[PDB]
Tab-separated table of C-alpha atoms and ligand atoms in Angstrom:
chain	number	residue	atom	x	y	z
A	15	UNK	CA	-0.812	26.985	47.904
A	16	UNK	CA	-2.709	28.574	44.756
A	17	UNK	CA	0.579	29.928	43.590
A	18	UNK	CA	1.992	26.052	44.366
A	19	UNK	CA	-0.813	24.331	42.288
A	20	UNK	CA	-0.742	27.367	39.383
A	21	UNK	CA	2.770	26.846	38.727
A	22	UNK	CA	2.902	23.000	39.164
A	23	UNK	CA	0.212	22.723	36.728
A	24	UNK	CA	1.853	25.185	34.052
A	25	UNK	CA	5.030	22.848	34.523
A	26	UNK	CA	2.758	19.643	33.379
A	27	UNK	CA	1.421	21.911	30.197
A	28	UNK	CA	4.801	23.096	29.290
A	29	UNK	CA	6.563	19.910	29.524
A	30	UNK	CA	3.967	18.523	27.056
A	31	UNK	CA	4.411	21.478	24.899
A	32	UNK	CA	0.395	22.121	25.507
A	33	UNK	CA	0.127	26.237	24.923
A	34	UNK	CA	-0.861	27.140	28.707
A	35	UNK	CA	-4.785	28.793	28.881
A	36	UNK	CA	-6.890	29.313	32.460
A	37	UNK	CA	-9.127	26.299	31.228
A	38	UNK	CA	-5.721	24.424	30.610
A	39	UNK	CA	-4.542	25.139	34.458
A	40	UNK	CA	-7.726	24.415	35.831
A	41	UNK	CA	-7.719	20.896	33.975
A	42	UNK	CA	-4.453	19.962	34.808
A	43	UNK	CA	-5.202	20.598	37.926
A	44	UNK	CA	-8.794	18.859	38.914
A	45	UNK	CA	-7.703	16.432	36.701
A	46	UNK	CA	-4.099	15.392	38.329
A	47	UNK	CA	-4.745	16.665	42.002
A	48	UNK	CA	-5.688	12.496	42.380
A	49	UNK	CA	-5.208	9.153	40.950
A	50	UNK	CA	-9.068	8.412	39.008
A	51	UNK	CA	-10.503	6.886	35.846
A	52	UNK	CA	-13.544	9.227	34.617
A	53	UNK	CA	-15.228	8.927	31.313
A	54	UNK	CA	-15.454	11.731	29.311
A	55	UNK	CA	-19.245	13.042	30.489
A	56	UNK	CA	-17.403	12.207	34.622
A	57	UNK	CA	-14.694	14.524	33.344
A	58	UNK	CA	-17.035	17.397	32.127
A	59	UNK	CA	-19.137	16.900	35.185
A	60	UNK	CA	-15.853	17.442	37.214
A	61	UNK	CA	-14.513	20.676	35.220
A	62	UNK	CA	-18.437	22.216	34.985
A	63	UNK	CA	-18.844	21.984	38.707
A	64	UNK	CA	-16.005	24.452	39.081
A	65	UNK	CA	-15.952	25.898	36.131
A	66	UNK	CA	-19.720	26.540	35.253
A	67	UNK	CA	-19.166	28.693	31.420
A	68	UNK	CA	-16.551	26.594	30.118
A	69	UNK	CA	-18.680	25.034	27.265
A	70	UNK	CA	-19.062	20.906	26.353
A	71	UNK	CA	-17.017	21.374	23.649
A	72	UNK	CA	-13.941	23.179	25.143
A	73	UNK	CA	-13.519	20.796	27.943
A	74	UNK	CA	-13.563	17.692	25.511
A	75	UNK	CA	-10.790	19.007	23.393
A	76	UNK	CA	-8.595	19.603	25.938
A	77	UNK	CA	-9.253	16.477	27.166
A	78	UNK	CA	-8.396	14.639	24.091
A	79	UNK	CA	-5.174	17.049	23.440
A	80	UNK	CA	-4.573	15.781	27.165
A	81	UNK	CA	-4.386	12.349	25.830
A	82	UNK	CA	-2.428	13.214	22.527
A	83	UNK	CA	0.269	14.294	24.719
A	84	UNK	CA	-0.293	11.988	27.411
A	85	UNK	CA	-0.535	13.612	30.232
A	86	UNK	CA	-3.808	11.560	30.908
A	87	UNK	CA	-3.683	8.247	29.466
A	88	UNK	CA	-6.374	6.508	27.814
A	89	UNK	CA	-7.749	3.108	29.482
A	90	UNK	CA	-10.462	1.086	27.550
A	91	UNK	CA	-12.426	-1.537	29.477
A	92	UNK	CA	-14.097	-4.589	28.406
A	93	UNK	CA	-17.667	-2.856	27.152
A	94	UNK	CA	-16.015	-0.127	24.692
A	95	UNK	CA	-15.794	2.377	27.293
A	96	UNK	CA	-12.578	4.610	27.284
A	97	UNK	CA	-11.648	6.168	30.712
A	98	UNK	CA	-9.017	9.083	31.004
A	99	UNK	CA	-6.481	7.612	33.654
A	100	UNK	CA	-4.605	10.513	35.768
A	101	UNK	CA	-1.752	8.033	36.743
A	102	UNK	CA	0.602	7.807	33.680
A	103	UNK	CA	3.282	5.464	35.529
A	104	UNK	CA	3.032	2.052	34.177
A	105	UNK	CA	0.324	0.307	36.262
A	106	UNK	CA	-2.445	-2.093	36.244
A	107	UNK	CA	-5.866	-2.713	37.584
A	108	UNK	CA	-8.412	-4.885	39.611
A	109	UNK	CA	-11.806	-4.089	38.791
A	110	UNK	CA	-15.159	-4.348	41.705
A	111	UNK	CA	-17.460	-6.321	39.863
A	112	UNK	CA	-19.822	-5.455	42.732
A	113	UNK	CA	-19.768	-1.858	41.906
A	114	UNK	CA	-17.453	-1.144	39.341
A	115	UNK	CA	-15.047	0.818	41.314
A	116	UNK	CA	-11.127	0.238	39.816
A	117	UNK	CA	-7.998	0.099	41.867
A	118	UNK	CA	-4.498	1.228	39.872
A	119	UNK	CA	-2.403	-2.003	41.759
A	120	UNK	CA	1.189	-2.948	40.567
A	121	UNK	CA	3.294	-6.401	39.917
A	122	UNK	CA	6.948	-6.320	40.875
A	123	UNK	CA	9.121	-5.614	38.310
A	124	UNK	CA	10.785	-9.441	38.039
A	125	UNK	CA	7.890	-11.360	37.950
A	126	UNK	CA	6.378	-8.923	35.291
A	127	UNK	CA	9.325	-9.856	33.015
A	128	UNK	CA	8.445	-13.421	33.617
A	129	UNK	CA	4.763	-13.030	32.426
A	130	UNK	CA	5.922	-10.780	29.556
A	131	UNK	CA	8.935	-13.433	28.571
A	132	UNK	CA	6.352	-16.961	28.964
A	133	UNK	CA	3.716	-14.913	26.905
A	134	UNK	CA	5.790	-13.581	24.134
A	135	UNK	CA	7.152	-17.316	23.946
A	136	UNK	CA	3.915	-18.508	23.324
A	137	UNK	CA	3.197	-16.068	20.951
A	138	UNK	CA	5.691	-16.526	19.043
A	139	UNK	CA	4.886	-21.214	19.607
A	140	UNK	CA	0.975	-20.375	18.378
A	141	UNK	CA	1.746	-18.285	15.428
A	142	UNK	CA	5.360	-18.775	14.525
A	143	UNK	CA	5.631	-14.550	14.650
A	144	UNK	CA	7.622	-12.959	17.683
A	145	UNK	CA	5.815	-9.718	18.818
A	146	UNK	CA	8.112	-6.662	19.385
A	147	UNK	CA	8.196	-3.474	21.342
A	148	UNK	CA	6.039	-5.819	23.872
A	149	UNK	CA	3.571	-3.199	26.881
A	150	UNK	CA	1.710	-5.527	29.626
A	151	UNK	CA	-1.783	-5.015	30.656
A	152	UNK	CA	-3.368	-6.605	33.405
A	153	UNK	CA	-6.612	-6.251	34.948
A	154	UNK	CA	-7.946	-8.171	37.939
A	155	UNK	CA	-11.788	-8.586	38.141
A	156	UNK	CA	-13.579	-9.835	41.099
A	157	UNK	CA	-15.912	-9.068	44.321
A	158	UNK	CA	-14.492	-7.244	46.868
A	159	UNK	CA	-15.448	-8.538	50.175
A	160	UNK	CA	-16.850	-6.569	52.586
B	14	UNK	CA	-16.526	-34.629	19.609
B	15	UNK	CA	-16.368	-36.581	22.999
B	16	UNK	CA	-13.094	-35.917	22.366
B	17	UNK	CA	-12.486	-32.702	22.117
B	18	UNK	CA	-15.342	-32.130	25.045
B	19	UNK	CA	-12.850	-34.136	27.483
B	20	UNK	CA	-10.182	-32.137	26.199
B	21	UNK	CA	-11.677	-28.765	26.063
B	22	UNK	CA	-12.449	-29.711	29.630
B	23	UNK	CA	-9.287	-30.412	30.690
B	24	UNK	CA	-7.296	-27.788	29.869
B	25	UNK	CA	-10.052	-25.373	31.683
B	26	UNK	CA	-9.004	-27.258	34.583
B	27	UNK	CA	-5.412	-27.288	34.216
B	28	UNK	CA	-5.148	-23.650	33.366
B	29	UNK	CA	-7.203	-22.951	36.886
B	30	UNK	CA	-4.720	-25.158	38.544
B	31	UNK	CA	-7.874	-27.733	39.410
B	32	UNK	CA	-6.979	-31.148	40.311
B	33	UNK	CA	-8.368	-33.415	37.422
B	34	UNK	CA	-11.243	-36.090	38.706
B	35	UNK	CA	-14.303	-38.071	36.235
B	36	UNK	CA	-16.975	-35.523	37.887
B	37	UNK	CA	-14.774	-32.270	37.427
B	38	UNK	CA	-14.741	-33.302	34.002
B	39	UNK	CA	-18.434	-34.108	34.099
B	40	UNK	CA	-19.284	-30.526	36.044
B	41	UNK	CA	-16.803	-28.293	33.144
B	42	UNK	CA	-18.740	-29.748	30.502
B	43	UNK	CA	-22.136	-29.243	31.650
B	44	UNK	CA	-21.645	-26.253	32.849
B	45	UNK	CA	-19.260	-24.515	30.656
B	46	UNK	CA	-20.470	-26.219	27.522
B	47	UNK	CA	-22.904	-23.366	26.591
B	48	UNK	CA	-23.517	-19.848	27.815
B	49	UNK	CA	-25.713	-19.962	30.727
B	50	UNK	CA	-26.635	-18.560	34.363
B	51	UNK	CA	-27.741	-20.527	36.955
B	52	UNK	CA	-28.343	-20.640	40.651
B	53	UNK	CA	-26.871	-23.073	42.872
B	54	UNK	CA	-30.272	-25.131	42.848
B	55	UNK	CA	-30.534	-25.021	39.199
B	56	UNK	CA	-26.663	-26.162	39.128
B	57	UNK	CA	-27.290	-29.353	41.036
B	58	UNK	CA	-30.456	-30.330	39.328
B	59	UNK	CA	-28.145	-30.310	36.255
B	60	UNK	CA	-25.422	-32.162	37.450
B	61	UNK	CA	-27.711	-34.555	39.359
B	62	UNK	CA	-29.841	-35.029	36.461
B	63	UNK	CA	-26.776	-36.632	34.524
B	64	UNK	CA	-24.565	-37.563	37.675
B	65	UNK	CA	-27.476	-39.329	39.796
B	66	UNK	CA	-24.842	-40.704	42.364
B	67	UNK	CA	-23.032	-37.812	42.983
B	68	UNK	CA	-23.941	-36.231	46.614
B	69	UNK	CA	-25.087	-32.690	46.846
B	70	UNK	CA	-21.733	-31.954	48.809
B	71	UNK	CA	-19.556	-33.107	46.571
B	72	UNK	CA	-21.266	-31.186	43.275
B	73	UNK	CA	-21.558	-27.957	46.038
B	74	UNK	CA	-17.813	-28.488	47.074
B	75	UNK	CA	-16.404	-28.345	43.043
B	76	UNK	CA	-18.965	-25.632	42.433
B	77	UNK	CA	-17.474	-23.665	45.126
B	78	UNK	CA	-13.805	-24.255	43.793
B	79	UNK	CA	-14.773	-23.509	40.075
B	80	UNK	CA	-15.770	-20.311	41.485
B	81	UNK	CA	-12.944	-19.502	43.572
B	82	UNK	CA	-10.920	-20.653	40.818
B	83	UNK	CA	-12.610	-17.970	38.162
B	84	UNK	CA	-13.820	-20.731	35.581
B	85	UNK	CA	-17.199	-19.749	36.523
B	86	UNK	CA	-18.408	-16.491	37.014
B	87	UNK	CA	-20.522	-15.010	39.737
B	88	UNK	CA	-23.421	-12.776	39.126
B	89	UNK	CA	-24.316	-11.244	42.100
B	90	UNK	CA	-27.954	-9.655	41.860
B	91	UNK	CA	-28.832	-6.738	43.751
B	92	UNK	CA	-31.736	-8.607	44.722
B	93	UNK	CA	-29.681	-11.007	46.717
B	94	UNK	CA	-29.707	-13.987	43.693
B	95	UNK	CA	-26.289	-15.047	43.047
B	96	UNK	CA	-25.893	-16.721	39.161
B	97	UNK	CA	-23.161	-18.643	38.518
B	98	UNK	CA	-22.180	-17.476	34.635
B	99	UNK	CA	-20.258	-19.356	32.154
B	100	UNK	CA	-19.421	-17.035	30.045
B	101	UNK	CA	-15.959	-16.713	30.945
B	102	UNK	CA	-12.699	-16.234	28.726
B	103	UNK	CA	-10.100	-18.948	29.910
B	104	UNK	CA	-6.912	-17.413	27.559
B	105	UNK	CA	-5.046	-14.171	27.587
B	106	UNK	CA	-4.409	-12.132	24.111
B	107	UNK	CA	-1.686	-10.639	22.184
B	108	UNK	CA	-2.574	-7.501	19.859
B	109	UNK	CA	-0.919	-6.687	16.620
B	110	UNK	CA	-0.569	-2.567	17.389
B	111	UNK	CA	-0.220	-1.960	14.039
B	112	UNK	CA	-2.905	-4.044	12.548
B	113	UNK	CA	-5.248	-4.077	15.474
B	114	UNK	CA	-5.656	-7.894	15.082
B	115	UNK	CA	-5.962	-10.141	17.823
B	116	UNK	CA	-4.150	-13.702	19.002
B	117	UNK	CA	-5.295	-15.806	21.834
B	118	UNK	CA	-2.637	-17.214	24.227
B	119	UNK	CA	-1.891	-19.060	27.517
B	120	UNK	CA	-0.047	-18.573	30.756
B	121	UNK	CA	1.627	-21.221	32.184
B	122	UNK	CA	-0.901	-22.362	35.623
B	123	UNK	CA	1.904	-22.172	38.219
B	124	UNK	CA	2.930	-18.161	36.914
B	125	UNK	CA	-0.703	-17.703	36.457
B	126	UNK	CA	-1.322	-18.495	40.160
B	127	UNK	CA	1.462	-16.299	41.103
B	128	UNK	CA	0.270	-13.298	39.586
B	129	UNK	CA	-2.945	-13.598	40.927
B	130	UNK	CA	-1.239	-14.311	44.325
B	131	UNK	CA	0.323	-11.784	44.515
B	132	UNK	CA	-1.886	-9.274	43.375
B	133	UNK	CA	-4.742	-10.415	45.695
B	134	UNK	CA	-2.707	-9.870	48.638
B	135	UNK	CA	-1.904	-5.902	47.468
B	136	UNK	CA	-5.349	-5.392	46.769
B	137	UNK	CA	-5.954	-7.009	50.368
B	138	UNK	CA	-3.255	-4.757	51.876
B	139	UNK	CA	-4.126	-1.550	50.404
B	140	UNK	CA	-7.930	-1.970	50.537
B	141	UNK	CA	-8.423	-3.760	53.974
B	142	UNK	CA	-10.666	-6.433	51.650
B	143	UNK	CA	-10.556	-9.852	49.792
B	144	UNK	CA	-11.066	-10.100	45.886
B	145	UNK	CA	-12.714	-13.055	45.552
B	146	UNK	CA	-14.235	-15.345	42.648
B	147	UNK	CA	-10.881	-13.620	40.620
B	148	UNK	CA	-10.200	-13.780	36.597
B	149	UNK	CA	-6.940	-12.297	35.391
B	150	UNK	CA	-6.723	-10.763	31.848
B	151	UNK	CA	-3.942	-10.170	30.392
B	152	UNK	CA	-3.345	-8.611	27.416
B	153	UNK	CA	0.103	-8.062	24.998
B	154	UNK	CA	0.654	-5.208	22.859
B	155	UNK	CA	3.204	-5.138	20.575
B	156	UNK	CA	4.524	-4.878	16.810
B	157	UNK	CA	3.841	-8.683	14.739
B	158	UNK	CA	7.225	-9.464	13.072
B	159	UNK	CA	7.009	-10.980	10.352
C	12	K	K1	-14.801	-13.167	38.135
C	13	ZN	ZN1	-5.243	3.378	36.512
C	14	ZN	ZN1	-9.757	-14.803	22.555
């Protein structure tokens, strides 16, 4: 329902303390209606399409205030490219080399801790440092066949 | 060093979970020496060049496991060429967040081949396809102490 999506959106603002606007709603909502990974000219395609006189320079703000208050998150691949992310739960990726196309995919919780414990040990072997406050990222690149 | 070549060598191996042999060793180093793309033809006259009594099977056979294995990478041409690519990164990293500096580090084979186990057959499940010719990166963020 547009009444649904109007005051599901307005929730996501609010809860980020982001001052709600009609470019805002509309944002929130092409931009979280489905799990993607657009670069910023893919996101101003997206918002232009249905929203023709928002200008360049509008849409890129809120994109990067989206980020700020992470309601988008940022994910850079290995290239310098920085893709806006609409899933913000904790997840990682496997990469098409064939076409580029990225799948979020997930490890299981116990096995994640394993990777995260052996790697922080050998951190800590190679440099004699421990690293703190310790975030996994994983990505997974390869052909996907057919 | 012939040293260091043998040992460079055999840690690529290890890491990939490849059984150690005298012409694995021979095939890492030629291959992975030096950044380079080759086709399958060019990749036995190069081994066969320096391993004259090695059958085309055999070189074919490790080939296709380096591949499968991710030590080599597969370029896979629109135009229906497929280049097998050395320029592949066999450690993970660890990032200082706060000073943006970078640490290489290693994952133990056996955990390394159960992450990518496990996270072939999700991306097989949810996808309907294979991920083949796999590399896992991993990276760890977190705060350097001291
Ligand atoms: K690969
Ligand atoms: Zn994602
Ligand atoms: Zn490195």
């Amino acid at each position: 329902s547009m009444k649904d999506s109007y005051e599901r959106s307005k929730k996501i603002l609010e809860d980020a303390g982001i001052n709600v606007t009609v470019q805002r709603l509309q944002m929130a909502n092409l931009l979280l209606s489905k799990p993607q990974h657009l670069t910023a000219d893919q996101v101003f395609q997206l918002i232009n399409e249905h929203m023709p006189n928002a200008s360049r320079a509008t849409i890129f703000n809120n994109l990067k205030l989206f980020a700020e208050k992470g309601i988008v998150n940022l994910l850079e691949l290995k290239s310098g490219i920085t893709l806006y992310d609409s899933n913000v739960i904790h997840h990682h990726h496997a990469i098409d080399e064939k076409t580029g196309e990225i799948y979020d995919i997930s490890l299981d919780s116990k096995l994640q801790e394993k990777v995260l414990s052996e790697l922080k040990q050998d951190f800590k072997l190679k440099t004699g440092s421990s690293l703190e406050n310790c975030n996994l990222s994983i990505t997974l690149k390869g052909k996907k066949n057919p």
